[PDB]
RNA sequence: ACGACUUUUUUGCCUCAGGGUGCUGUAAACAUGAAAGUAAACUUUACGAUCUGUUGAGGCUUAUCCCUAGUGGUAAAGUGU
RNA sequence: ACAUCUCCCUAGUGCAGAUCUUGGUGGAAGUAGCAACUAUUCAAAUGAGAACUUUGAAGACUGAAGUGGAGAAGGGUUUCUU
RNA sequence: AUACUGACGUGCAAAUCGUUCAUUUCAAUCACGUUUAGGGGCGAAAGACUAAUCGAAAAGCCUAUUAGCUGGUUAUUUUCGA
RNA sequence: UGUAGGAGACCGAUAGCAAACAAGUACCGUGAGGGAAAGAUGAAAUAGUACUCAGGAAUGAGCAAUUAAAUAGUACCUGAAA
């Protein structure tokens, strides 16, 4: 089903695939979306969100 | 329809079998011995439970778990299992 | 041509085919035989394995590199709650074998025996033995007297009372002893005499006897031909696998000749040892009955933390030299010797001077869980 | 191997827990303790491998260990004669 | 659509086989076998039906000499939406 | 491509797999373009190689080549018969 | 040989032109080239399976229905043997 978007919304952004966060609730809502300009307001909106890099850090070294 | 207690050893039943099937049988495990007890075909092992089990890795699931069984109708009979977190396993005993 | 070397064939030929047992309970194959100038008595006994300790033992055997100083040896425990004795069996001497006459049963028989003859006690409705053992004592005795009559060997019928044990089993292990001795009169008086009482080993055995121990084998079930008989294994460059006989039988005869073995069933065979000597008699009511004359100390013969696989020891017990067939939990025949034993062995009087109770899970530091409590001191 | 066999089905049995027995080797935690020294205050304050104390501790111990009328459990009722 | 034994002309005229040819079909048999490439689990959705569709949560692996980007030859609409 | 004469050997492959191993600034390796063609080419030479085909490639024809040799070589009854 | 006629004591769909059919086609080969299989409902589909019931769907059944005939149902003539 949603696959369409998720890689829209992998463009969108500018980031991995790996990296994105569909609410897994209202999902009817996404899946309504179908265009770039339908992902920008869901990302306006609080739908789909950026999730953080696996953090990391060199305070060790 | 009833409530209960228990503390499953997960690590007599897992004994046997291999590092790579491990955790997976200790999820497979919980799954037979609440439907065992609780009379049903159906259990639904929450999200919580399955994190709790997985947390040390494949390698070795912990030792005890404290779970709550819940009977629930709405065949139609079923339960949930639900993960209660503890200080110490000591000196706990089934309840109801 | 001729094999290039000549070794004795691997394994006897003597026990096969080394297919499964078809009992669990062993089977005397055959008594001891009737010396009429003896008193009537029994000649067999039946017993559970409850596991192995060492014991220590002075020699007196002159002449030897051993000679005077204590030895260390390998020793069994096997529990022996006192035999129920149930039913008086005759049979008769024909040229097509011993035919059973008739068989006289006690008036009451308990439900550790009754369970016996069923598979499903829970599920059935216990309505087995209750009428026949009703029947009045003058048929009971026209019985006894067609046997007294007739019969040239009489037998007793015997069983364990499992629930003066700690194994799991309530259905009790019936078992056949013959009587050997007088008259054919004496015979049955003794078993009529005996009859719905308990019979314990006290009265079957003595001090220092040397018995045979029948028993079936521990399992391991099918197993490669290497282990279950012993062949050596193949070099390691071999194509096809190492360890596996590398000839079945030559071209001719045609056909694979028997004698080779082959891979199968390894355990649970039948196994008749022979000439084991008793080391000790214990006695249940006794709280001296591990104790010696060297040690002094009040304490049980189970072993420190329980008996592997087997607990607790709780009645009367025989401690018997060495080893004998299979597994813990397993049931034990004991036989009298086939002929009275004449050997300097069979002569000799045993002052043992030492049992070991310590633990057999691990490696044991005390005698007794008292001996540790004092050795460490207060803990937490 | 699968069958098969051995069992038990409420004075049982499973289940945890306590006790027993071992196995490992002394947990985390805290100390205006010890510690090679080090640095910086107008004796006191910093860092510190490691060590000692509370500590024969902590952890594990039937899944094919032992004991316990200790806890809570103990369904299906089918099929053949 | 078929005979012709009334007589007789005529022939690519009669098969068990050729490791025959061609087409079909069994026993072997519900068997050999479906083994590389570290390994998956829980919940939700869709649906007649979900171990291997989708989503979330975990746990994992590839580990910049990559199952990552680009490109060449060859392929050729394999692309995308429905 | 050395060794394991290891895995596989009705293969994962009509030469694959694992481990071991030889090779690395030169008589070095690769790409693409280009040159040489069948009693011919090419060969740091094995009769090697020239598209799974080599002590004479592949394709079609002369050609249904030819074979003192192998296999096969089809209804009945009746008579004489090596 | 190309094309047009006319013929037959010729073949009858494994035959006869390789080819009665969308055949020098599909397919295979780097290429020269190699190169198939596969005809038949019924008088009439301007008679090609209406309708109900059980099915998610395929399908099935019917007291329902085209036909002279559907055990002629688009694998459609007949329908042998294994």
């Not at chain 1, 770039?36 to 070294?61: C, D, N």
């Not at chain 2, 070795?60 to 109708?73: G, T």
């Amino acid at each position: 089903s949603l696959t369409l978007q998720k890689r829209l919304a992998a463009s969108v952004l500018k980031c991995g695939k790996n990296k994105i966060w569909m609410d897994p609730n209202e999902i009817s809502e996404i899946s309504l979306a179908n265009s770039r300009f339908s992902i920008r307001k869901l990302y306006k909106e609080g739908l789909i969100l950026k999730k953080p890099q696996k953090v990391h850090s060199r305070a060790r070294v | 329809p009833v409530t209960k207690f228990i503390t499953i050893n997960l690590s007599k039943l897992t004994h046997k079998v291999c590092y790579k099937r491990k955790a997976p049988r200790a999820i497979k495990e919980i799954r037979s011995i609440a439907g065992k007890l609780m009379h049903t075909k159906d259990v639904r092992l929450d999200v919580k439970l399955n994190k709790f089990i997985w947390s040390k890795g494949v390698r070795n699931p912990p030792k005890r778990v404290r779970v709550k069984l819940e009977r629930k109708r709405n065949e139609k009979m079923y339960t949930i299992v639900e993960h209660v977190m503890v200080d110490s396993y000591k000196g706990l005993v089934n309840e109801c | 041509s001729h094999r290039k070397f000549e070794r004795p064939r691997h394994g006897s030929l003597g026990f096969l085919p080394r297919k499964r047992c078809k009992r669990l309970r062993g089977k005397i194959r055959s008594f001891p035989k009737d010396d009429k100038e003896k008193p009537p008595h029994f000649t067999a006994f039946m017993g559970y394995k409850a596991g192995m300790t060492h014991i220590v033992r002075e020699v007196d055997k002159p002449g030897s590199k051993l000679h005077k100083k204590e030895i260390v040896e390998a020793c069994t425990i096997i529990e022996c709650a006192p035999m129920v004795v149930v039913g008086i069996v005759g049979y008769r001497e024909t040229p097509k074998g011993l035919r059973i006459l008739s068989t006289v049963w006690a008036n009451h028989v308990s439900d550790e025996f009754r369970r016996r003859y069923y598979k499903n006690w829970y599920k059935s409705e216990k309505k087995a033995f209750t009428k026949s053992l009703n029947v009045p004592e003058a048929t009971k005795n026209c019985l006894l007297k067609r046997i007294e009559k007739y019969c040239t060997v009489l037998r007793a019928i015997c069983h364990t009372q499992p629930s003066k044990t700690p194994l799991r089993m309530k259905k009790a292990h019936i078992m056949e002893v013959q009587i050997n001795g007088g008259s054919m009169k004496e015979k049955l008086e003794f078993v009529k005499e005996m009859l719905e009482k308990n019979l314990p080993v006290s009265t079957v055995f003595n001090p220092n006897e040397m018995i045979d121990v029948i028993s079936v084998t521990k399992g391991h079930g099918t197993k490669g031909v290497v282990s279950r008989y012993g062949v050596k294994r193949l070099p390691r460059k071999t194509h096809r696998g190492l360890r596996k006989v590398a000839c079945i039988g030559a071209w001719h005869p045609a056909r694979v000749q028997f004698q080779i073995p082959r891979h199968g069933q390894k355990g649970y065979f039948h196994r008749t040892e022979r000439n084991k000597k008793i080391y000790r008699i214990g006695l249940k009511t006794d709280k001296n009955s591990a104790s010696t004359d060297a040690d002094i100390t009040e304490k049980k013969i189970t072993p420190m933390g329980g008996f592997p696989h087997y607990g607790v020891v709780n009645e009367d017990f025989l401690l018997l030299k060495g080893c004998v067939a299979g597994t813990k939990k397993r049931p034990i025949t004991l036989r009298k010797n086939i002929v009275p034993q004449v050997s300097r062995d069979a002569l000799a009087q045993v002052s043992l001077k030492f049992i070991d109770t310590s633990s057999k899970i691990g490696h044991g530091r005390f005698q007794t869980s008292e001996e540790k409590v004092k050795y460490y001191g207060p803990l937490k």
